[PDB]
Amino acid sequence: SVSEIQLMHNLGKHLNSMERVEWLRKKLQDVHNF
Amino acid sequence: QLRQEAEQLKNQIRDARKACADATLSQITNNIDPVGRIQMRTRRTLRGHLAKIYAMHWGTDSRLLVSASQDGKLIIWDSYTTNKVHAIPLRSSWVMTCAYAPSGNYVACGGLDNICSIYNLKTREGNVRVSRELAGHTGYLSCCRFLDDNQIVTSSGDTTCALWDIETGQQTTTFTGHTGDVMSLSLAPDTRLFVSGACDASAKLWDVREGMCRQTFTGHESDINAICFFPNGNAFATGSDDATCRLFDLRADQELMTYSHDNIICGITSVSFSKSGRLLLAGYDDFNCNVWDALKADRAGVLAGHDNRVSCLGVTDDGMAVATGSWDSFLKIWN
Amino acid sequence: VMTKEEQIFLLHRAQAQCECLPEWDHILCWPVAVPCPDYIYDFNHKGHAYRRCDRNGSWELVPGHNRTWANYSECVKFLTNETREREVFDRLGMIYTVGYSVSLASLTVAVLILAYFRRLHCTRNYIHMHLFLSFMLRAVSIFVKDAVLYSYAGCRVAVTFFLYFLATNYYWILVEGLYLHSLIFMAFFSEKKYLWGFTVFGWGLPAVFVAVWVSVRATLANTGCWDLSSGNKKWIIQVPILASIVLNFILFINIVRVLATKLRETDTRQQYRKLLKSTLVLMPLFGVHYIVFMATPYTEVSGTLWQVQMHYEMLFNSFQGFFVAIIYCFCNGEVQAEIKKSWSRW
Amino acid sequence: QRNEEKAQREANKKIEKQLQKDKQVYRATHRLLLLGADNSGKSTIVKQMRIGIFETKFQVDKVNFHMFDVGGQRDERRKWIQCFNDVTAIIFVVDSSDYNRLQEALNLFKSIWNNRWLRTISVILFLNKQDLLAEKVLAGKSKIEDYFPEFARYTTPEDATPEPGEDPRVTRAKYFIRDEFLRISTASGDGRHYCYPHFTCAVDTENARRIFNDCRDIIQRMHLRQYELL
Amino acid sequence: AQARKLVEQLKMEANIDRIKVSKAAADLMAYCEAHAKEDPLLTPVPASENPFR
Amino acid sequence: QVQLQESGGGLVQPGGSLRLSCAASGFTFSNYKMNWVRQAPGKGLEWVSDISQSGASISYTGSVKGRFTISRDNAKNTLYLQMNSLKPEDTAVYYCARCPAPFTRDCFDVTSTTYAYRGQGTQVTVSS
Questions:
Q1: Looking at the structure, do residues C251 and C124 belong to the same domain, yes or no?
Q2: CA–CA separation, C42 and C39 (whole Å)
Q3: Any CB–CB contact under 8 A between D81 and chain F?
Q4: Domain boundary residue among C79, C97, C128?
Q5: Which of chain E's ends, N or C, has fewer CB atoms near its CB within 10 Å?
Q6: Distance (Å, rounded) from C-alpha C265 to C-alpha C73?
């Protein structure tokens, strides 16, 4: 595979998934404090 | 008996020469100021030749110049505007010389076909025509200089210079004496004499009317490639494969000066004189032309702009500029 | 796959649905064991969340708090708290930021040296300038991509420009080999005749399938900054680039095979000595390092295959333009011929 | 007036238009210098190219070749040989059957090889009159060792390709002459130019392809030199 | 017969009226001095008169 | 004026030793590659041997290899051809030739019919 494109894709997915996980983490903290 | 008698006259001639060498041009001009540092710059580069330029000549108008290239083309340029006035396709691709008539009506050229073809530029039709082919030389044509619209003098590789009549195409006078390929010609200002340099390290002064060798000049070690009269017609300069240029006096009949440097170990292809005669422009095989102070042998300057062997030189009649052809197919104009 | 935005939308839909007794706790609607909700993805889904209902019919509180007791430990079974992969992505990004910096620097000098020198204006140095320019544009497009994405139509063109300027470099490397191949495999190749076709092929043909990719990514999968794979739509750009790598490797074998014949038919150990040196300096030009991992598919990031593929590629892809400038514009016989000659004059 | 300025600029455009057409033909055509001697048999090689200076045009695989025989000059060639510094190749034809004049052919090859202006021009060497050489060796009345004493301690090289039914003495004799030329070629020629030896007779239905193939090799090696590969 | 004509040519060469190289050298000094101002390569010419600039 | 005068040569028995001296003048001897050329009666000019500027490089025709020795003396501007074992086939006029150009590895036209930089020659008549 074209490695530069592949690395773009991969960094994208990783960053996106992390930013999600972090939203889930707040929602969890939220319910906890509730 | 004649072998001993031959050296008897050579020794007597050499003895008479030593009786006239009371000083030297080197020590006579010991006190004159130098010319300084001649810094000429490429004012014009003429492009359009596919192959190497073998020779070029200036018109008497000092504006139109003709150049020959080893691709069967005779381009007439306008130096002021860089414009191709004519581009004459030759029968033979191997052309070693070209001449522009003093009247400008004709151009001559030839090379390894042993023919000085004459081309008519002022024809009543659109293009140029081959006026006449000169046949009669038994070797490659090395130089050809017009005398008039009808007289041309040609120097060949058959050790012979010939004076022709373009009206009939026949050879009127034949100049014999050289034991080597005659490579260069120069006509005197008055056109009554012409000097000739051959591949026997000798130059001969010829009488055009008489058809006889007036004087013979030796001094060079190898083949004389280039020759040029002094502006006043009482001297000439020669360039040879021994990496030297020599200035000869017609009246004194002796070599006056030598233009050599230790760093210079390449042959001279071309020589020329500025309008005054104080600068001797010499083209070398090291791809650059040196400017020589013709009264002090000092290297006044260098024309380093060419990528291959410098083939031809010429100073214009009015002395505006120097055209410098080369084996890189570019004719440059320096001022 | 799932954006934060989309995940928020799915929880909001579950909230609107929601809107001991039922209540919304910010993640799930209670009706006690509730399956870990499908709409959350980083939660597991074969687990349950738990509450306790009083004998009094009130949700059980946390001793000394207003908090409602809940146990979501099963739901959170899949959670990786820290930066493990981020460090690797930072080292890969640092490897090619340094590499593309010295490549862009060298080629800017290299492309300028070939520009003004008129005796250097061969049809071969012409093809070298397009290759040098394509190398700089690729490096510049990566720097622009990193600043725009990792620092919605603004980013969508930074990605498309990155994709096109990458494919042009891969195609000007193919042109470099197709030109040298024609100089040898075509009997008296007319270099001038096909000079227009190479320029159109090098720059135009990348734009043909990059615009096809944008034409299909604007009508099927318009979501995001276009910097995430959308299934098999990634092969519109990659397959043409992968094809240009196999062909340029096939040409390199022909050139090296033909070159070895010429050293043979001019020896002994000198036939295999000059051959080696000439083969090595043809690798930067032909991009021969690309043939190793171009059959590798998309793989798991923590994988050892992935880690060496990315470290190998970023190290060599970034420095490729640096080696091409040195070999074909600095340690060039006829370039230094115009350097000491021009230095002597002035 | 200014009327002449546009007319002059227009005639230059017409001139330049014709020069572009001529440049395409000029670059597309290969020029070869045909060298040799009275007994060489250059004429017979010219007779095989049926497909002051004598010009031959032949065509091989739709490529135009221009062979020049400089026959109208004297025996001194040190000035007119500088004209052919731009040719693709020098076709050097040698009478391999005449040992008396073979050293003249060796010395002519050495002066060509080492000239300042021909030191980038590859030589296609044609060792002509192989028919006469073969019959001369078997007769035994003339010995090569009389003219070349180094022939006594010379043996056929391993990389020799004798024709079917060829006497080993002829193969040793004919390769010694080839190796005499290659001693000079390899002593000074380092990548700038190469020798292309061939064996030919008057009956060959060939030598038009041989020149064409060797000119293709000369052009290829010129390209690989520019790329610093060879 | 070659030397028979060669000596005759050599006899003409011996009979020329050679002058002292002082006069030969001083004549080229005089000519290069009188024509100095008319030569536009020995001395640069201003761009007003120069047609090549 | 370029002049090459040769001394020695004449009547000698087969197998005799004969020495030719070529006194060169009118050029810088040390710059030019020298040569020896002979013309057998009723035959063409033949190249015999050559020596470089310094004398490092030497060559021979093959018929005279191991019997003729060529040495130059830059100091005295002289060229030598030492004959050791003469044969009746060696009878000829020996000319001392010079390369046309002064710093070149190529001698063009030395054996030409009318070459300029060759001596008059010395007859070397070898017979019983």
A1: yes
A2: 10
A3: yes
A4: C79
A5: N
A6: 77
